Design an enzyme around this catalytic site. Structure first.
Site, PDB file in Angstrom:
ATOM      1  N   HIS A   1       0.864  -1.183   0.000  1.00  0.00           N
ATOM      2  CA  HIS A   1       0.000   0.000   0.000  1.00  0.00           C
ATOM      3  C   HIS A   1       0.899   1.230   0.000  1.00  0.00           C
ATOM      4  O   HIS A   1       2.127   1.118  -0.019  1.00  0.00           O
ATOM      5  CB  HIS A   1      -1.104  -0.004   1.093  1.00  0.00           C
ATOM      6  CG  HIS A   1      -0.628   0.159   2.511  1.00  0.00           C
ATOM      7  ND1 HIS A   1      -0.138  -0.892   3.262  1.00  0.00           N
ATOM      8  CD2 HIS A   1      -0.650   1.229   3.345  1.00  0.00           C
ATOM      9  CE1 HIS A   1       0.167  -0.464   4.476  1.00  0.00           C
ATOM     10  NE2 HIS A   1      -0.164   0.813   4.563  1.00  0.00           N
TER      11      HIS A   1
ATOM     12  N   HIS B   1       1.533   3.850   2.107  1.00  0.00           N
ATOM     13  CA  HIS B   1       2.135   4.508   3.265  1.00  0.00           C
ATOM     14  C   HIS B   1       3.664   4.349   3.276  1.00  0.00           C
ATOM     15  O   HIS B   1       4.230   3.455   2.641  1.00  0.00           O
ATOM     16  CB  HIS B   1       1.540   3.965   4.578  1.00  0.00           C
ATOM     17  CG  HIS B   1       0.118   4.364   4.817  1.00  0.00           C
ATOM     18  ND1 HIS B   1      -0.738   3.647   5.638  1.00  0.00           N
ATOM     19  CD2 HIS B   1      -0.603   5.414   4.354  1.00  0.00           C
ATOM     20  CE1 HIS B   1      -1.909   4.255   5.676  1.00  0.00           C
ATOM     21  NE2 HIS B   1      -1.861   5.313   4.888  1.00  0.00           N
TER      22      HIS B   1
ATOM     23  N   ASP C   1       5.829   3.314   5.371  1.00  0.00           N
ATOM     24  CA  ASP C   1       6.453   2.072   5.828  1.00  0.00           C
ATOM     25  C   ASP C   1       6.495   0.995   4.743  1.00  0.00           C
ATOM     26  O   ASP C   1       7.193  -0.022   4.931  1.00  0.00           O
ATOM     27  CB  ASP C   1       5.781   1.553   7.109  1.00  0.00           C
ATOM     28  CG  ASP C   1       4.315   1.260   6.947  1.00  0.00           C
ATOM     29  OD1 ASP C   1       3.621   1.882   6.109  1.00  0.00           O
ATOM     30  OD2 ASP C   1       3.829   0.375   7.691  1.00  0.00           O
TER      31      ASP C   1
ATOM     32  N   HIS D   1      -7.483  -1.493   5.892  1.00  0.00           N
ATOM     33  CA  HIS D   1      -6.567  -0.500   6.463  1.00  0.00           C
ATOM     34  C   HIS D   1      -6.391   0.688   5.528  1.00  0.00           C
ATOM     35  O   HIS D   1      -6.270   1.835   5.979  1.00  0.00           O
ATOM     36  CB  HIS D   1      -5.225  -1.182   6.730  1.00  0.00           C
ATOM     37  CG  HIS D   1      -4.088  -0.242   6.996  1.00  0.00           C
ATOM     38  ND1 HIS D   1      -3.852   0.318   8.234  1.00  0.00           N
ATOM     39  CD2 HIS D   1      -3.128   0.250   6.171  1.00  0.00           C
ATOM     40  CE1 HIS D   1      -2.790   1.100   8.162  1.00  0.00           C
ATOM     41  NE2 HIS D   1      -2.340   1.086   6.919  1.00  0.00           N
TER      42      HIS D   1
ATOM     43  N   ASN E   1      -3.621   3.560  13.306  1.00  0.00           N
ATOM     44  CA  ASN E   1      -3.949   4.678  12.435  1.00  0.00           C
ATOM     45  C   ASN E   1      -5.018   4.214  11.468  1.00  0.00           C
ATOM     46  O   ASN E   1      -4.774   3.318  10.653  1.00  0.00           O
ATOM     47  CB  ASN E   1      -2.699   5.089  11.663  1.00  0.00           C
ATOM     48  CG  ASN E   1      -2.990   6.107  10.583  1.00  0.00           C
ATOM     49  OD1 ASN E   1      -3.991   6.821  10.635  1.00  0.00           O
ATOM     50  ND2 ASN E   1      -2.119   6.160   9.575  1.00  0.00           N
TER      51      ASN E   1
HETATM   52  C1  LIG Z   1       5.133   6.624   7.959  1.00  0.00           C
HETATM   53  C2  LIG Z   1       3.746   6.670   8.512  1.00  0.00           C
HETATM   54  O1  LIG Z   1       3.212   5.369   8.632  1.00  0.00           O
HETATM   55  C3  LIG Z   1       2.188   5.162   9.451  1.00  0.00           C
HETATM   56  O2  LIG Z   1       1.669   6.111  10.018  1.00  0.00           O
HETATM   57  C4  LIG Z   1       1.728   3.766   9.698  1.00  0.00           C
HETATM   58  C5  LIG Z   1       1.548   3.222   8.269  1.00  0.00           C
HETATM   59  S1  LIG Z   1       0.652   1.612   8.334  1.00  0.00           S
HETATM   60  N1  LIG Z   1       0.603   3.687  10.651  1.00  0.00           N
HETATM   61  C6  LIG Z   1       1.024   3.723  12.012  1.00  0.00           C
HETATM   62  C7  LIG Z   1      -0.039   3.281  13.118  1.00  0.00           C
HETATM   63  O3  LIG Z   1      -0.831   2.417  12.705  1.00  0.00           O
HETATM   64  O4  LIG Z   1      -0.002   3.834  14.235  1.00  0.00           O
HETATM   65  C8  LIG Z   1       2.261   2.858  12.257  1.00  0.00           C
HETATM   66  C9  LIG Z   1       3.242   3.484  13.213  1.00  0.00           C
HETATM   67  C10 LIG Z   1       1.847   1.469  12.672  1.00  0.00           C
HETATM   68  S2  LIG Z   1       3.073   2.796  10.566  1.00  0.00           S
HETATM   69 ZN   LIG Z   2      -0.488   1.797   6.351  1.00  0.00          ZN
HETATM   70 ZN   LIG Z   3       2.032  -0.161   8.396  1.00  0.00          ZN
END
Ligand SMILES: CCOC(=O)[C@]1(CS)N[C@@H](C(=O)O)C(C)(C)S1
Ligand SMILES: [Zn+2]
Ligand SMILES: [Zn+2]
Ligand SMILES: [Zn+2]
Length: 231
Positions: A83, A85, A87, A148, A179
């Site tokens: 996806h 994002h 990461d 997600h 998130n």
């Molecule tokens: C670079 C930003 O990437 C995020 O914000 C993610 C993407 S899945 N979402 C976050 C959450 O779920 O708190 C996390 C820290 C698990 S990584």
């Molecule tokens: Zn994500």
């Molecule tokens: Zn993630």
């Protein structure tokens, strides 16, 4: 045995061998005041490797390539991001500079461009409708529907019965939703049900963040998402 967030310094990457020719990669990142672990996958493809997802940023992804060379010693020739994002796509430019062909669905590429994240070069066709599956070398890619994120993909390794759920699947230790700003809460349980129906034979289930388990991670994620829905 599986490395936890408390054992990996930010900047270092660990590999965990699941089966013959299948590994996960584990990295950590600081975000919003806390440290989080993050998983991806590596699948042997003859004398080459297929990578699933970056290691969350350029520095971690460079360390990932170095750890692959040290521990495995075969070249990464293709990568898929599951996806948009950071990461999952942060580090794509490092991969491209190293000669890796980087891939994502057109949806993912569009959303990454809007967000200002790095954009994989190649487009994965045949994944735009819920329930679509396509073969990509030694894996199958599956679009279960929005969860997600609206673009999230899952990856199945048939030779090893490994299901990589990405960030649509939560580890057991996460008992409250993460998130969800980009999520489709109303559809997420139905998308999980599509995963269960398509890969009921899966033996080893990998979440986007945290410890692997079995198909019980799907029921766990449904429980957490529905509790958030009912907040
Ligand atoms: C670079 C930003 O990437 C995020 O914000 C993610 C993407 S899945 N979402 C976050 C959450 O779920 O708190 C996390 C820290 C698990 S990584
Ligand atoms: Zn994500
Ligand atoms: Zn993630
Ligand atoms: Zn190319």
């Amino acid at each position: 045995e599986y490395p936890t967030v408390s054992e990996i310094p930010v900047g270092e990457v660990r590999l965990y061998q699941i089966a013959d020719g299948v590994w996960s990669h584990i990295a950590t990142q600081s975000f919003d005041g806390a440290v989080y672990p993050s998983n991806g996958l590596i699948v042997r493809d003859g004398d080459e490797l297929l990578l699933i997802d970056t290691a969350w940023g350029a520095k971690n992804t460079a360390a990932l390539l170095a750890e692959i060379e040290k521990q495995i010693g075969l070249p990464v020739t293709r990568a898929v991001s599951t996806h948009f994002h950071d990461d999952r796509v942060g580090g794509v430019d490092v991969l491209r500079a190293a000669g890796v062909a980087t891939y994502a669905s057109p949806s993912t590429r569009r959303l990454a461009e809007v967000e200002g994240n790095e954009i994989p070069t190649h487009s994965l066709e045949g994944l735009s409708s819920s329930g679509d599956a396509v073969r990509f070398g030694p894996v199958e890619l599956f679009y279960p529907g929005a969860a997600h994120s609206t673009d999230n993909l899952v990856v199945y390794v048939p030779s090893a019965s490994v299901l990589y759920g990405g960030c649509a699947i939560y580890e057991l230790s996460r008992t409250s939703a993460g998130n969800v700003a980009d999520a489709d809460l109303a559809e997420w349980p139905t998308s999980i049900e599509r995963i269960q129906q398509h890969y009921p034979e899966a033996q080893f289930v990998i979440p986007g963040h945290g410890l692997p388990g079995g198909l019980d991670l799907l029921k766990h994620t449904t429980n957490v998402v529905k509790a958030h829905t009912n907040r």
